[PDB]
Structure formats: C-alpha cells, structure tokens
Amino acid sequence: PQITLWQRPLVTIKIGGQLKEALLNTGADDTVLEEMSLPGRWKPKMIGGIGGFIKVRQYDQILIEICGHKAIGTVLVGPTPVNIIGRNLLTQIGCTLNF
C-alpha cells in the first residue's frame, strides 16, 4: 500500500517464528532488531548511528515477512532502541519513496 509519514511508518513483521513491530527506515542501510533469539550462527559487528556505536550480531540469509511480504537477507540483532527495517530488505519488497 501507500504509507504517508504523519506517523511513524510501523509494520508488523514475522521473524524466527515471532511477531514484532518494526519501523520502515529509508535512513538505514541495514536491518537492526532488538535482542531476540534467532536460530543460526552469526558474526559480531559494530554499527554506528547518531549517538555513537553499538555491538550487534549479524545473521545472514534470515527470512522475514514484512507486512506479509517475504524477504531473505541480513538481519542485525542488538541494543537498538527500535526495530528497524533497512534498505537491504526494503528493496526486496519493492518499497519506494514518492514525492
């Protein structure tokens, strides 16, 4: 659907068997989720935002259903204040900006 920006663009996602709410974030290259348990193996990583850096765990090729659209890609898990769907997955569900 089209989404306007008067409110935070939140969507329901299903990942790792669990249901969550996440922000569609054009200002994020990567997808970053709050602490949650995801099955596979991972690789430590450091990502930088507005207030500095956080350590996250990088999971590759994770299935995510974003507003009922399926995508597979990298998901980062760590102490982000909010679940963020980044451009890496936005492209996969055909998400675009319009003005």
Residues that bind ligand 53F (CB under 6 A): 23, 25, 27-30, 32, 47-50, 81-82, 84, 86
In this structure, the chain runs to a length of 99
Cβ proximity to a copy of itself, 3 vs 72, nearer residue: 3
Site for a copy of itself (CB under 8 A): which residue of 35, 49, 60, 63?
A: 49
C-alpha to C-alpha distance for 22 and 12, rounded to whole angstroms: 6
Site for a copy of itself (CB under 8 A): which residue of 14, 54, 65, 74?
A: 54
